UniProtKB/Swiss-Prot annotation, chain D:
Pfam families in the record: RdRP_5
PROSITE patterns (UniProt xref): RDRP_DSRNA_REO
GO biological process: viral genome replication
EC number: 2.7.7.48
SUPFAM superfamilies named among the record's database cross-references: DNA/RNA polymerases (SSF56672)
Name of this chain's protein: RNA-directed RNA polymerase VP2
Organism field: Aquareovirus C (isolate Golden shiner/USA/GSRV/1977) (AQRV-C)
Curated annotation (Swiss-Prot), chains E, H:
Function: Inner capsid protein that self-assembles to form an icosahedral capsid with a T=2 symmetry, which consists of 120 copies of VP2, with channels at each of its five-fold vertices. This capsid constitutes the innermost concentric layer of the viral mature particle.
Coiled coil location: none
Gene expressing this chain: S3
Name of the protein in question: Inner capsid protein VP3
Subcellular location: Virion
Swiss-Prot record, chain F:
Subcellular location as annotated: Virion
Name of the molecule in the record: Inner capsid protein VP3
Naturally occurring in which organism (per UniProt): Aquareovirus C (isolate Golden shiner/USA/GSRV/1977) (AQRV-C)
Mapped zinc finger ranges (C2H2-type): 2-25
Quaternary structure and interacting proteins, as annotated: Homodecamer; each decamer is made up of two conformers of VP2, called VP2A and VP2B. 12 homodecamers assemble to form an icosahedral capsid. Interacts with VP6.
Family membership noted in the UniProt record: Belongs to the turreted BTV-fold inner capsid family.
Role noted for this protein: Inner capsid protein that self-assembles to form an icosahedral capsid with a T=2 symmetry, which consists of 120 copies of VP2, with channels at each of its five-fold vertices. This capsid constitutes the innermost concentric layer of the viral mature particle.
Length: 49, 99, 49, 1273, 49, 27, 99, 49, 49
RNA sequence: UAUAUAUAUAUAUAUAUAUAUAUAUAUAUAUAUAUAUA
């Protein structure tokens, strides 16, 4: 059904639509905390070994 | 997988609508003097388990983690092996599988 | 002596009969089918924490 | 249970029957009904002695503190006002006073009393102030007590009777016995304690007794005194007790409600006190549920199809809930608690909040809790003095913060002024919008079509009406001698009567009469001030036509009237469900008082100017609806003034603007008050019926659109808000109807808008409305309120309090109704308990008890004889109430969704078939010659032994008396007829069309010998229908009543052993149920509160079928061929006849005659007749030809697909070949499917596949007989 | 299989092949972008083979 | 509180009743 | 345009009457055992709005002032671009546009 | 499309082509005269391009 | 009837190097937007003037 | 006597909510001091 019943807006511009969609997702340091955790993990692992 | 799927479904511009398919189906002319109506059968088969239509996004999300988990066709959807090709409901199931 | 005792007997004893004079075993049977379908739902759509 | 022992023997039997112990029978049915009508009502209270209550409730003596009434009333300017006690000018309701001193004693019942004849005489004759004040107080106090469908004590008796014994379990695995039990209900204990004050020798004198003429009171001894508020408190307590039992709530919540009522009753003005703290419960529960951390659950996934104008929605799965989706708006605890502190009820809030905190996740329990707590608000129909009501509501004028400067107008055009182009702002937007619509209306040959003209004139006439006296005066004043038809016994104030008088007169002569007084009426409400009904006279209603037409065009061609087409009200159900889903943010808005805020100084002047200018495009000399063009002076140019012609439409505007500027002049004549009629004008728009919704909805949409696109972007601050506020438009973001409106935001990307921006947005909207004097009264609580429907996270919440079990509105001092009407009240009462999802098993038990009491009644001649009668209980089965237990069956196997009428009978018999046949064979000798459906076993005698036929035919009998004719009055009947026809047939072409059609029709029907006497809908009978309606609106004479009782009894006593021909044939079909259908949705997800595994049957029915009406291929038959019809005739009759003719294979000219009989011209008649075909017709469309319809109870379910591809009329491997419909299946199969699905819906439990298995006669024989019957009727 | 039904079956199958669905285009051109962006958002990076 | 008619098992919350009812009751 | 159209309709020998067309259409024989009757589809279209076909006179009047105003076909009176030629209502719509 | 329906559709189209309508003659021969006369009557003379 | 901006610009001319008037940042059309979005087009026109 | 299931109670751990106390920050009110103006 999903394959055969796919439709969109009449005059969609993908670049514009995704521009609005992704706007709130890159407003904070969220992606960077995992980087910091990875570093601490590295130090902890080496020291433990 | 669930996290990605729900997140994915939020941003997409694609929308699903079973109605368009049903109209294409029902507009087929047929005789009323036949004992069996293929139209009714396929319509009955076409409706999912629930009115769910969520498995599609589940398949998309799985690709990002195929190393962890693999989607598989539901075992219950397979046509019964004892049947023969002339058994229409079995035939339709085979068509949906290959699609 | 009581409709209660009769009803309990019907549910318990004639649990799988198909006589038209009895209704309740059939409905209970339908409910059992209802539950089996319910299993088919979540078996391909479980619940996450 | 010693209480069961306390009941008299017949009632004990009835309780056993209701509990399911024994099959019900007419014998015990009468014994119970009879004994209730003979014993004094106080005994019901006496029953309460045998309940060992164990609840922590204390009734403070503070209740019995009657405040003197004399200081609560005064007369000034010769009108009896309310003089509120507190400084609040709204304390205009019934005070808390001791009525005692104003009582005499009755000769029939010496204990109770009524008003002093001396007081009413002096108030009438002497117009003495204190006499009048006492009278007014007595009248309204009695009226407030009368706002019940019947005496509350009877309802309490019902509750005790059903609750006296636990119901027997059925065999169903989901049949949970009741968890709640008596001796734990605070309400009943409260009733006990308070009633202890009203006993002198263990007699329990009722504080009041309701009668057809109001209510009487008991004279207190010298020691005691009765405060009227106590009676009201009892009703609320009884109503709460019933509701709590049916909703099956915890005693703690009921405890809070009791304390709620007690605190209100303790203070003065019980009504006012309740009204002030009304919204406390919904705010505590509905507005704030999931403002915590442990949030989660499952929620519906609803999608709105692309052509959003169509309002089509699709269920497309479920969505997991998580914290990111939890509601964003602030809770409502702080304001509510602050309010409760005023009445020192903070404990209630603490209890509610603590209990609420036990539901962190959205599931059945959470919504069930919400349903129960919200069911605690008082269900009393509040009533106040109409004089105070009219004085308090219409005394308001809107406050405009930036009025249109006088220099913004052009020179006058006789009455109107056009708007200068240089003026901008919202007013300019409003002006252009109306002007554009007026232009479109201007050139439109849709009007001047004689048929359409007939529709408009006919639309103006109804059985009700008003202002006839003003009409007769104004025209008599101008020398116009109107006709009279009094001998034709029809009310003068009926809009029909005045219309007949007007028929002959040239219209322009009547123009002076439009500036005449308009009478008024009041209709009380449950949770707000009473509504207003302001019926214009027929002439005024005619003049205002352009205003309506333009408004309609604005609605139908911009935002598609925002559902104001009202085609089926259920289209708002999926809308609010979608609006409440987690991904969407919704805001509830509504004009504070749209009727009171629309006015001429700002609004109507702009509209009048725009319409008058918008009509300039068009022939200046073109009369409209008999209004000719005229010459008016144009003064736009100070240097070159002149006069020019203007079309009739503009002339209408000229007068219409004059009327609006003058303001409406109402005349109040309230009956509850004493000798205080007067008249005063106001700018308040009439807004008495749906005819006003068009104007307010149009203006509502217009202002909202301008706000979104212009005002807000120019004024708001948040850049993010601007980004999301843009790319938004009303056609896909806003809906409304009258004042009510819904605004929903575009889906914030996987996120929610900051409450900060929301506050900024909501604040600016308030200011925007303040500009032109609209108080917007907005709120944001992540819920859906629209047309009094409530949805939370895609689950509908039935607000049961708005349908109190005991309460009923009565707008007059007298009930003015006859006994048999009570039956229809019962039927309507029961359905609400199905629409709202209550405990279906217990609700059914209570319903039957109500039916039993209603089953019996009598009447007495004004001087002469008495009369009496009562129905066999089988009537109510035919009327649509499932039986609890049939002989040989098991109790509680029939679902509430069982259809009424023949369908319900057929389904019941179909299930009951085999037992009846076998049992009849053993019990009775065989009948003398073979039967089509039965063997020789002769079940019909057995059915007669059960009195089935008696009930079946009794329900068919009419229940309102008929007025009698007269011959000199028939000269007036003809005079009434002639004029009604004259008013209807303004032109001649329509009359020629109808006459030709009728002449051809009867000629064909007889000569072709289809049949004779076929009552075919035709225009010539429309005046006849009007006349009958007009005469029916009158109070019948006693002779008609006596005829009714005699006829009813004879119909009961006449021994008949046959149903209608249709039902006889329907019994020939055998239907069986297979397995359960595949589920619609996940059973975990709640869709309607209370439709949960506890309330199994509703939970089954909804889960299997799904609620969202989703007729993707069926369209539920709304495509009727005749889109345009005149009032009076029934479309459902017309299409039924047409299809019936088509099945009968009538020649085309037969269709031509029928179509021409309702005004269709020959060309369009041929065009319409060609469209008729068995193919494009829908299942229900064709099935209705034999009166097989869909029960109203099903209107909330998605039955389309089931009927389409789940009711097998011919399964190859099961059906006997004898039942093969063959070629006639094109019109046979829908009938069988309808019968099948009706039987499937009848039984309890999950929905199963329905299959025809056998027809005793051949399917051909069935079809042949059906064709015969179709030809006969 | 009676040819009338056989004619019907090939008819309905033909209808499905003619539906102008949007999904195939979305899979080839737009879905990869959505994945590529979201890969930087989920708490767990993609893990493929 | 809530109870199952087949085994008399009693439940504090309805969700527990539902999951039990659907899963625990079926020569 | 309105003034000119009124004048045109005021004086004209031509009379618009669809009775002969429908009479010539409904006389076509077809099986009653089919599920679709294109005759009904046609007659559902061509619905006489009762305005006595103001559009026709409106189009004629527009010619006199073509240098000021132009008549265009309404957007709604188009076949949806999502449909196929086999969708009968779409085909009929396209036919009317061509005519 | 089932041929029976196809046979019907070509039939009705054929019927339309055979209707002896008067309009085409009126357009070519009579309507211009009506315009030519009325052009001297309307308060606004014709304005063409 | 204020027109503060116009006079502000003229005044700022005499004090450039101390205060500089700039076009409002939010007056620009959104970057993701396309030329076909008329409200954005007007913004660009006013911005140019 | 033991095992298993269900219910209730008690203890311990973890999470969430509410209340109270203490500390820190911000706002409002009142008092006192100082400055300035009248
Ligand atoms: Zn159990």
């Amino acid at each position: 059904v999903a394959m055969l019943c796919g439709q969109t807006e009449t005059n969609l511009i993908p670049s514009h639509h995704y521009g609005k969609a992704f706007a709130p997702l890159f407003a904070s340091n969220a992606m960077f905390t995992r980087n910091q955790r990875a570093v601490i993990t590295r130090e902890a692992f080496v020291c433990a070994r | 997988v669930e996290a990605l799927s729900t997140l994915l479904r939020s941003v997409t511009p694609l929308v699903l609508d079973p109605t368009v398919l049903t109209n294409a189906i029902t507009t087929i002319s047929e005789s009323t003097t036949q004992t069996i109506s293929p139209i009714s059968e396929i319509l009955r088969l076409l409706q999912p388990m629930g009115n769910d239509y969520a498995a599609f996004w589940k398949c998309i999300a799985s690709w990002a983690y195929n190393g962890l988990v693999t989607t598989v066709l539901s075992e219950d959807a397979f046509p019964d092996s004892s049947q023969s090709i002339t058994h229409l409901p079995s035939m339709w199931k085979c068509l949906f599988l290959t699609l | 002596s009581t409709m209660s005792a009769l009803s309990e007997h019907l549910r318990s004893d004639h649990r799988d009969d198909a006589s038209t004079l009895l209704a309740t075993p059939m409905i209970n049977n339908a409910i059992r089918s209802f539950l089996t379908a319910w299993d088919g739902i979540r078996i391909l759509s479980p619940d996450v924490s | 249970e010693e209480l069961f022992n306390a009941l008299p023997q017949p009632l004990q039997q009835l309780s056993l029957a209701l509990a399911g112990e024994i099959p019900l029978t007419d014998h015990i049915f009468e014994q119970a009904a009879s004994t209730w009508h003979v014993q004094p009502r106080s005994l019901t209270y006496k029953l309460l002695d045998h309940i060992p209550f164990s609840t922590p409730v204390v009734v403070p003596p503070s209740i019995y503190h009657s405040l003197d009434w004399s200081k609560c009333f005064a007369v000034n300017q010769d009108r009896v006002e309310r003089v509120p006690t507190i400084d609040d000018p709204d304390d205009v309701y019934v005070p808390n006073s001791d009525i005692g001193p104003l009582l005499t004693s009755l000769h029939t019942i010496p204990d109770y009393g009524f008003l002093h004849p001396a007081i009413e005489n002096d108030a009438t004759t002497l117009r003495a102030e204190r006499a009048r004040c006492a009278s007014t107080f007595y009248k309204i106090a009695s009226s407030q007590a009368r706002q019940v469908k019947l005496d509350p004590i009877r309802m309490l008796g019902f509750l005790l009777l059903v609750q006296a014994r636990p119901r027997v379990p059925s065999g169903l695995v989901t049949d949970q016995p009741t968890r709640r039990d008596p001796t734990q209900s605070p309400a009943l204990h409260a009733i006990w304690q308070v009633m202890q004050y009203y006993k002198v020798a263990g007699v329990y004198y009722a504080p009041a007794l309701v009668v057809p003429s109001g209510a009487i009171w008991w004279i207190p001894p010298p020691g005691k005194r009765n405060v009227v508020s106590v009676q009201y408190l009892l009703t609320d307590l009884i109503n709460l007790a019933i509701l709590a039992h049916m909703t099956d709530m915890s005693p703690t919540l009921e405890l809070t409600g009791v304390l709620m009522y007690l605190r209100a009753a303790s203070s003065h003005s019980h009504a006012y006190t309740l009204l002030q703290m009304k919204s406390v419960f919904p705010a505590l529960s509905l507005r704030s549920m999931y403002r915590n951390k442990g949030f989660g659950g499952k929620a519906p996934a609803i999608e709105w199809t692309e052509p959003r104008s169509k309002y089509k929605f699709r269920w497309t799965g479920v969505t997991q809930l998580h914290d990111g989706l939890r509601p964003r708006s602030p809770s409502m605890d702080v304001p509510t608690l602050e309010v409760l502190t005023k009445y020192e009820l903070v404990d209630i809030g603490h209890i509610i909040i603590r209990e609420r905190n036990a539901h962190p996740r959205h599931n059945h329990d959470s919504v069930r809790f919400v349903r129960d707590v919200m069911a605690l608000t008082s269900g009393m129909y509040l009533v106040r003095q109409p004089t105070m009501s009219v004085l308090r509501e219409y005394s308001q004028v809107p406050d405009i913060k930036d009025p249109i400067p006088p220099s913004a107008w052009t020179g006058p055009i006789g009455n109107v002024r056009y708007l200068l182009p240089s003026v901008q702002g919202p007013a300019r937007h409003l002006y252009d919008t109306w002007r554009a619509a007026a232009r479109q209306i201007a050139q439109d040959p849709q009007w001047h079509d004689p048929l359409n003209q007939a529709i408009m004139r006919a639309q103006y006439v109804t059985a009700r009406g008003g202002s006839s006296a003003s009409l007769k005066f104004a025209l008599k004043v101008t020398g116009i001698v109107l006709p009279e038809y009094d001998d034709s016994k029809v009310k003068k104030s009926s809009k029909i009567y005045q219309a007949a008088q007007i028929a002959r007169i040239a219209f322009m002569l009547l123009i002076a009469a439009i500036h005449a007084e308009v009478t008024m009426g009041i209709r009380n409400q449950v949770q707000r001030r009473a509504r207003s009904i302001m019926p214009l006279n027929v002439i005024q209603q005619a003049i205002s036509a352009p205003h309506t037409l333009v408004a309609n065009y604005i609605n139908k061609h911009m935002n598609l009237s925002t559902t104001s087409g009202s085609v089926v009200t259920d289209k708002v159900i999926p809308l609010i469900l979608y609006a409440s889903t987690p991904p969407n943010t919704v805001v509830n808005v509504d004009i504070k008082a749209c009727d009171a805020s629309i006015t001429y100084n700002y609004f109507l002047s702009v509209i009048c100017g725009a319409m008058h200018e918008g009509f300039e495009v068009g022939n200046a000399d073109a009369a409209f609806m008999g209004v000719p063009s005229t010459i008016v002076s144009d003064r736009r140019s100070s240097v070159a003034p002149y006069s020019r012609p203007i079309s009739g439409l503009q002339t209408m505007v000229q007068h219409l603007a004059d009327l609006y500027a003058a303001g409406f002049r109402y005349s109040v004549s309230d009956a509850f008050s004493s000798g205080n009629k007067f008249s005063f004008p106001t700018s308040t728009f009439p807004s008495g019926s749906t005819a006003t919704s068009t104007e307010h909805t149009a203006n509502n949409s217009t202002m909202m659109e301008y706000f979104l696109n212009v005002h807000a972007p120019s004024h708001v601050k948040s850049a993010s808000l601007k980004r999301i506020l843009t790319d938004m438009t009303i056609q896909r973001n806003y809906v409304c109807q009258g004042d009510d409106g819904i605004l929903l935001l575009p889906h914030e990307a996987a996120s929610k808008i900051s409450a900060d921006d929301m506050n900024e947005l909501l604040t600016c909207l308030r200011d925007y409305g303040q500009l032109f004097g609209w108080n917007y009264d907005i709120d944001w609580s992540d819920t859906a309120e629209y047309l009094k429907l409530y949805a939370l996270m895609g689950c509908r919440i039935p607000n049961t309090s708005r349908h109190p079990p005991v309460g009923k509105e009565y707008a007059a001092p007298q009930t003015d109704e006859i006994w048999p009407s009570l039956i229809d009240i019962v039927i309507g009462h029961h359905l609400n308990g199905v629409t709202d999802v209550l405990n279906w098993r217990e609700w059914l038990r209570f319903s039957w008890a109500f039916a039993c009491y209603s089953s019996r009644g009598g009447y007495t001649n004004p001087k002469g004889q008495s009369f009496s009668a009562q129905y066999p209980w089988w009537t109510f089965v035919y009327l649509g109430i499932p039986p609890i237990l049939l002989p040989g069956q098991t109790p509680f196997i029939h679902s509430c969704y069982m259809p009424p009428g023949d369908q319900g009978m057929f389904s019941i018999l179909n299930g009951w078939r085999d037992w009846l046949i076998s049992h009849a064979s053993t019990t009775l000798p065989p009948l003398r010659h073979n039967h089509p459906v039965w063997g020789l076993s002769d079940v019909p005698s057995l059915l007669s032994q059960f009195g089935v036929y008696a009930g079946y035919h009794a329900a068919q009998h009419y229940r309102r008396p008929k007025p009698a004719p007269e011959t000199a009055s028939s000269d007036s009947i003809n005079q009434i007829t002639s004029d009604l026809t004259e008013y209807l047939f303004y032109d001649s072409a329509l009359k020629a069309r109808v006459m030709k059609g009728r002449y051809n029709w009867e000629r064909l029907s007889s000569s072709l010998s289809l049949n004779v006497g076929s009552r075919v809908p035709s225009l010539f009978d429309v005046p006849g229908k009007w006349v009958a309606a007009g005469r029916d609106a009158e109070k019948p004479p006693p002779s008609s009543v006596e005829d009714m009782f005699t006829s009813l009894n004879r119909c009961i006593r006449r021994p008949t052993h046959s149903f209608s021909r249709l039902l006889e044939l329907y019994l020939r079909v055998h239907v069986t149920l297979g397995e359960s259908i595949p589920l619609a949705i996940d059973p975990d997800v709640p869709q309607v509160a209370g439709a949960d595994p506890a309330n199994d049957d509703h939970w089954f029915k909804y889960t299997c079928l799904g609620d969202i009406p989703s007729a993707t291929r069926n369209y539920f038959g709304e495509s009727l061929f005749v889109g345009r019809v005149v009032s009076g005739l029934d479309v459902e009759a017309v299409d039924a006849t047409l299809l019936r003719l088509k099945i009968l294979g009538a020649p085309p000219e037969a269709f031509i005659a029928v179509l021409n009989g309702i005004g269709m011209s020959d060309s369009e008649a041929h065009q319409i007749a060609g469209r008729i075909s068995l193919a494009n017709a829908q299942l229900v469309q064709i099935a209705r030809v034999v009166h097989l319809s869909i029960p109203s109870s099903w209107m909330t379910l998605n039955t389309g697909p089931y009927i389409h591809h789940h009711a097998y009329d011919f399964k190859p491997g099961i059906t006997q070949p004898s039942a093969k419909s063959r070629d006639k299946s094109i019109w046979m199969s829908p009938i069988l499917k309808l019968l099948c699905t009706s039987y499937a819906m009848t039984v309890a439990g999950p929905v199963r596949t329905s299959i025809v298995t056998e027809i005793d006669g051949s399917a051909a024989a069935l079809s042949g007989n059906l064709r015969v019957w179709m030809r006969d009727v | 299989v009676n040819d009338l039904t056989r004619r019907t079956m090939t008819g309905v199958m033909t209808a499905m092949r003619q539906v102008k669905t949007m999904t195939p285009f979305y899979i080839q051109h737009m879905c990869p972008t959505e994945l590529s962006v979201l890969a930087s958002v989920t708490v767990t990076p993609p893990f493929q083979v | 509180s809530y109870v199952c008619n087949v085994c008399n098992a009693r439940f504090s919350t309805m969700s527990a009743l539902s999951e039990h009812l659907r899963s625990d009751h079926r020569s």
